[model samples]
Target: GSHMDGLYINNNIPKTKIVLESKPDKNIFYSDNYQSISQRIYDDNVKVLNLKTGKNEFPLDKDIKDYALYFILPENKKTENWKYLISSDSVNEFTIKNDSSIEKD
Candidate 1:
């Protein structure tokens, strides 16, 4: 069985850092792309950052979850694309899953 399908994040910023953060209830899995995970288990701050130079590639795992995707671009080119993705509960599909698929009632 295929446990994972190929997926990755391309760091468009050549000389900047790309930080990926998630909440306690969320999960993030990365391949051999990132430098290292910078968070203590049971802590609320779950993050991954790319410290290496050049256009880096961050290959991710199969399971996906909600994350605050933001770019920590430097002061000069930062102001333009500094927005982050904040997903509200109402906008997210119900995460309740059972052995067999069930319809919302």
Candidate 2:
């Protein structure tokens, strides 16, 4: 259950508040592996920014999961004509959500 019980930080602020291994991602597959929530948050520098989760409503919860998966993408995406290579189903996870604030093109 190393991974299944593990939950990583789910940033609520926006793209900038999220963190990754590097900037302007040079690799489409710069994936890292981990199994801890607190560590991910600390390594990413989120909690220090005063981003808090609601009591009785943890900052990151399973969408009915014991573990979590992450896919870091650009906060503000460029248009298709902006000129850049694309990646995989990760974007699908990003775009499909229940937030009222989120709007899709």
Candidate 3:
């Protein structure tokens, strides 16, 4: 989901204080062995909520349209050797269906 080498730039300026907020009770079991999934979700949008929060961080007042989220990592960071890149969209989607199946194997 989240990549260490992934450039976090806004207006050509690197951003600091990146946090992955999530609806903590929702149980979106992310890959802890790698970069947080919440952070990845936030990269696609502005807010990520913990499962426990159960709060929709996205602005409800505005029309929320779904956009295709894409991530690119450096060649060195592309392989499973880097656990972060191992969690692909397909894996994440599969996790959504089978929470018990969400393992690094």
Write the number of the candidate with greater lDDT, choosing between 2 and 3: 2
How many residue pairs clash in all the candidates, one count each?
Answer: 0, 0, 14
- Candidate 2 stretches with Cα past 4 Å from truth are 1-29, 34-38, 44-94, 97-105
Ranking, lDDT, top scorer first = 1, 2, 3
Cα shift from native, residue 13, model 3 (Å): 36
What TM-score does candidate 3 get on C-alpha atoms? 0.19
Regions of candidate 3 where Cα sits further than 4 Å from its true position = 1-44, 53-62, 67-105
Candidate 1 accuracy as lDDT? 0.35
The segments of candidate 1 whose C-alpha lies over 4 angstroms from its true place after superposition are 1-14, 24-45, 51-54, 59-61, 75-77, 84-105
Q: Which candidate number would show the highest lDDT if scored against the true structure? A: 1
Instruction: Report lDDT per candidate.
Output: 0.35, 0.27, 0.25
Model 2 over residues 1-105: C-alpha lDDT tens digits?
Answer: 122222233334344222222122334223332223235565442232222322111233224222222333234432222112122212211221224122222
Question: How big is the positional error of residue 27 in model 3, measured in Å on the Cα after superposition?
Answer: 26
RMSD per model, one decimal: 14.3, 16.5, 15.7
TM-score of each: 0.38, 0.18, 0.19
Write one digit per residue (lDDT tens) for candidate 3, span 26-74.
2333333224543555443434222211111112212332222222222
Ranking 1 against 2 by lDDT, winner: 1
Candidate 1, 12-100: lDDT as tens digits? 33444545555433333332113333344234554546534322334432344444544444444433333233333212211112221
